[PDB]
Amino acid sequence: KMHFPRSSLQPITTLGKSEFGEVFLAKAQGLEEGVAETLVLVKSLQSKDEQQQLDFRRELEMFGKLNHANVVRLLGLCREAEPHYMVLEYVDLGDLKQFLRISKSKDEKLKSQPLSTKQKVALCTQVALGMEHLSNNRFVHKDLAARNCLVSAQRQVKVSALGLSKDVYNSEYYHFRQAWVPLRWMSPEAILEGDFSTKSDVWAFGVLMWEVFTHGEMPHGGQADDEVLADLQAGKARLPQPEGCPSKLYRLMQRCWALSPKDRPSFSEIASALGDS
């Protein structure tokens, strides 16, 4: 495909483990013309299980096909030998969730740089633009959340797919029907029927906006996974309005959480709604 020699990868930091394998940062020598070494994100496929092989292929096909400022690029593939690697574009900072939590500590006495409403909207708009492109290209992400978005030091956002469910973000994944699913970001049809669509990505986007407006708080924090699932089954799952979130944008969040996927806004509609602000 877009073959890259693994011999030009110098591992720098292990980020964590996904259901596919290890996720690590590396310096990629002579990856882009002009630049000597490019810091990249590497996903390995250490699982020879059928489902994981198909998911790894699904991700590299998606990133390989998409081309947008708010979506990470597929920079290389190492499928010439074992284990296989997916080489993705990285950032100078890290994931969006980490950025949100560092911006505003729960301890008011610590130094902080809280995001203004304008800054929060700018982060949301960039994700909506990246997701509008992804969905325009008939793809379904299935794991949209702040942990899976990347941000630079100047708040430029890119939709990615890290899925560090085994360690770093193990608290955001739930053991359900023999799989580790992102429970607190899932619409009822996606988790209870396995029905994933652009509209299940719309529900997840609603949750992501909530994560931004709370400076990265856990959705339904203080409720155990089992309670979250039972509330979702009963149609009682309701994220509260964060303080500092305008009424207009919370109602938009609420329409993303419509029970029927047919009543949720499309990404083009969300990108426009965010533009009024």
> How far are the Cα atoms of 5, 77, 127 from residue 2, in angstroms, in the given order?
10, 6, 26
Residue 226 annotated to the active site: no
Q: Is the C-alpha dihedral spanning 272, 202, 59, 184 positive or negative?
A: positive
Experimental method for this entry? Answer: X-ray
Report resolution (Å) to 1 decimal. 2.0
Q: What CA–CA distances, in Å, run from 252 to 92, 126, 137, 148, 265?
A: 31, 16, 23, 22, 8
Domain match, 55 and 104 both? no
Query: Do 65 and 109 fall within a single domain?
Result: no
* 105 and 86 housed in the same domain: no
- 208 closest CA partner among 252, 163, 147: 147
Give the residue from 41, 73, 90 where a domain finishes: 90
Query: Is 158 in contact with 72 (CB distance < 8 Å)?
Result: yes
Q: Which of 60, 90, 120 is the last residue of a domain?
A: 90
For the chain, how far is it from start to end, CA to CA, in angstroms? 42
- For residue 132, the domain's CATH number is 1.10.510.10
Boundaries of domain holding 112: 91-277
Domain final residue pick, 90, 118, 149: 90
Q: How many domains does the chain have?
A: 2
Of the candidates 95, 143, 167, 195, the residue annotated as catalytic is 143
228 near 220, Cβ under 8 Å? yes
Half-sphere exposure of 192 (CA within 13 A, CB side): 12
